[PDB]
Amino acid sequence: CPVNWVEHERSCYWFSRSGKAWADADNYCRLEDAHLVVVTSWEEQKFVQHHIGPVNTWMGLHDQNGPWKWVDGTDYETGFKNWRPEQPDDWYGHGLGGGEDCAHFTDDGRWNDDVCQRPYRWVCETEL
Ligand SMILES: [Ca+2]
Ligand SMILES: [Ca+2]
Ligand SMILES: [Ca+2]
Ligand SMILES: [Cl-]
């Protein structure tokens, strides 16, 4: 793994300390030959909650094109899921326009879908 990245079970991770809209966050990870983190197991989830703490953080999961997809192509329905109760809920009540198409870890680690343009911290990942 590159410096500033954390290796774990064959994967490399980078944790941002500033916020970007999901699209910008996405492009950022790609420019690093990486992709927004893709969580496929309880241990990987535990591993990420540990480093982000109680902070809303974007992951490589979105339903911007329709169905839920992990930016690396990993299958969603067959894969690990850790949604917060009553989520995803594609809420429109925020008043910003549209529903909610980007997944982020909430403060307790469980996921929530929110407005993609909101600036949150993010995590990049790359496999060995
Ligand atoms: Ca992963
Ligand atoms: Ca949605
Ligand atoms: Ca939501
Ligand atoms: Cl915001």
Swiss-Prot record:
Please tell me where Ca(2+) 2 binds in this chain.
63, 90, 100-101
Q: Which parts of the sequence bind Ca(2+) 3? A: 87, 89, 100, 112-113
Q: How is it modified after translation?
A: Phosphorylated on a cytoplasmic Ser residue.
* Residues covered by the C-type lectin domain: 8-125
| Ligand binding (Ca(2+) 1) | 38, 44, 125
Tissue specificity, per the record, is: Expressed exclusively in hepatic parenchymal cells.
Question: In this UniProt entry, which cysteines form S-S bonds?
Answer: 1-12, 29-124, 102-116
Other remarks on record? Calcium is required for ligand binding.
The free-text function statement in the UniProt record for this protein reads: Mediates the endocytosis of plasma glycoproteins to which the terminal sialic acid residue on their complex carbohydrate moieties has been removed. The receptor recognizes terminal galactose and N-acetylgalactosamine units. After ligand binding to the receptor, the resulting complex is internalized and transported to a sorting organelle, where receptor and ligand are disassociated. The receptor then returns to the cell membrane surface.
Task: Note the subunit structure.
Answer: Interacts with LASS2. (Microbial infection) Interacts with hepatitis E virus capsid protein ORF2.
Task: Return the protein name.
Answer: Asialoglycoprotein receptor 1
Organism, by scientific name, is: Homo sapiens (Human)
For this protein's source organism, the top of the classification is:
Eukaryota, Metazoa, Chordata, Craniata, Vertebrata
Q: Give me the gene this protein comes from.
A: ASGR1
Portion of the parent chain present: 154 to 281 of 291
